[PDB]
Amino acid sequence: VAFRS
Amino acid sequence: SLLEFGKMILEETGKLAIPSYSSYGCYCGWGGKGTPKDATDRCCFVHDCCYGNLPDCNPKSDRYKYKRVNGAIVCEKGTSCENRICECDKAAAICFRQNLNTYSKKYMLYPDFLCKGELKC
């Protein structure tokens, strides 16, 4: 899905 | 969890989290460095900071519950981490809704090298 920084 | 965040994003904005917010600007979906490109990307910057406030929580996978009280998101009580994760996600979904008016598709799939520099939380 997203899963950032 | 990331899946719940994405359902919250769709509910608020009518855009699918993947692809509208998963690769946007410098901070959405994969933030780290750079000046945020616009207000939507600043939503993601702040959301990244918000998760950063929770080093012993696991916001990608930990599930929380929330309900709507006419339109408004109300986080329901879970564990401390779930509550705090939900409040991060709620704020970001609201932020994306507040800034839909300036969302720009030219920041989808924004290339990493255009994101330089650390900005403190």
Give the Cα separation of B17 and B93 in Å (integer). 10
Q: In A, which residues are within 8 Å of B27 by CB distance?
A: 4-5
Secondary structure of chain B in HEC code, one letter for each residue: CHHHHHHHHHHHHCCCHHHHCCCECCCCCCCCCCCCCCHHHHHHHHHHHHHHCCCCCCCCCCCCCEEEECCEEEECCCCHHHHHHHHHHHHHHHHHHHCHHHCCHHHECCCHHHCCCCCCC
Interfacial residues of A (vs B; Cβ cutoff 8 Å): 1-5
CATH of the domain at B54: 1.20.90.10
Q: Sign of dihedral through CA atoms B67, B68, B73, B77?
A: negative
CB B119 within 8 A of CB B36: yes
Interface of B with A (CB under 8 A): 2-3, 5-6, 17-18, 21-22, 27-32, 44, 48, 51-52, 60
Name the method of structure determination. X-ray
Per DSSP bridges, beta strands B72-75 and B66-69 are antiparallel
**CB contact set of B46 (below 8 Å; sequence gap of 6+):** B91, B92, B95
Chain A hits for B22, Cβ within 8 Å: 1-2
Task: Say if residues B107 and B45 touch (Cβ distance below 8 Å).
Answer: no
User: How many structural domains is chain B composed of?
Assistant: 1
Distance CA A2, CA B74 (A): 22
Q: Contact B30/A1, CB-based, under 8 Å?
A: no
Q: Which residues of chain A have a CB within 8 Å of the CB of B5?
A: 1-2
Resolution value, angstrom units = 1.2
Query: What's the CA gap between B70 and B19, in Å, rounded?
Result: 28
Rounded-to-integer distance, Cα B104 and Cα B21, Å: 11
| B92 touches B46 (CB < 8 A) | yes
- Rounded Cα distance between B5 and A2, Å, is 9
Q: How many CB atoms lie within 10 A of CB B115?
A: 19
CA–CA dist B26, B83 (Å, integer): 27
Domain that holds residue B107: 1-121
